[PDB]
């Protein structure tokens, strides 16, 4: 009976069908559902990191949990089937992977730090890209030179130092690239 009383949920980059399912089920669970990102939002369900709502939460609101689209349907399913819930309300099991929708490429980084970066990208839900293509989201560069670097500038792909990755992992959110320039 109203397990999500006091929760205020908002979506970013969630398709209409899934957004309608989430708002309907979250409302039945007792939550408030907000189309705008209001000051009282507690949980942001995100389908991408490259949005103004996501950027605001990553920069200014670490208290707000960034959740996977599957959170509300999975919690609703347990609740409507009469299963016991706990005070965690499955939140920690459905946090959005930090590097969700990231496609990360590397350039000018030696071993073993190059393969360690690749492992961390995969561990945190990103896609690792050995080759640079126009759909890469971040190029982590050891130096500002070379073929991948020049093509990332041409394709307007973010070029960041590895500190972007480390700070994004510890912040549990993709951070903006202008703070991690070479």
């Amino acid at each position: 009976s109203k397990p999500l009383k006091g929760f205020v949920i908002c979506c970013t980059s969630i398709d209409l069908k899934q957004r309608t399912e989430i708002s309907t089920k979250a409302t039945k669970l007792g939550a408030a559902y907000r189309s705008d990102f209001t000051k009282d939002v507690t949980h942001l369900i995100a389908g991408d990191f490259d949005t103004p709502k996501y950027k605001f939460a990553a920069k200014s609101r670490p208290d707000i949990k960034i959740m996977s689209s599957e959170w509300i349907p999975v919690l609703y399913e347990s609740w409507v089937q009469g299963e016991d819930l706990d005070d965690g309300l499955l939140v920690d099991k459905h946090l959005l992977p930090t590097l969700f929708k990231c496609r990360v490429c590397l350039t000018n980084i030696g071993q073993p730090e190059r393969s360690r970066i690749e492992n961390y990208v995969l561990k945190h839900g990103g896609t690792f890209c050995p080759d640079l293509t126009r759909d890469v989201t971040h190029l982590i560069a050891g130096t500002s030179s070379g073929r991948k670097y020049e093509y990332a500038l041409k394709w307007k792909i973010n070029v960041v130092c590895v500190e972007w990755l480390w700070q994004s992992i510890q912040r549990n959110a993709v951070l903006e690239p202008q703070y991690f320039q070479l």
């Binding site: 705008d36 990102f37 209001t38 000051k39 939002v41 103004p52 709502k53 605001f56």
Partner: peptide, 10 residues
């Protein structure tokens, strides 16, 4: 509540 970021325009 106070709007921090508006809804994405469809």
């Amino acid at each position: 509540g106070e709007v921090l970021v508006p809804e994405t325009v469809a």
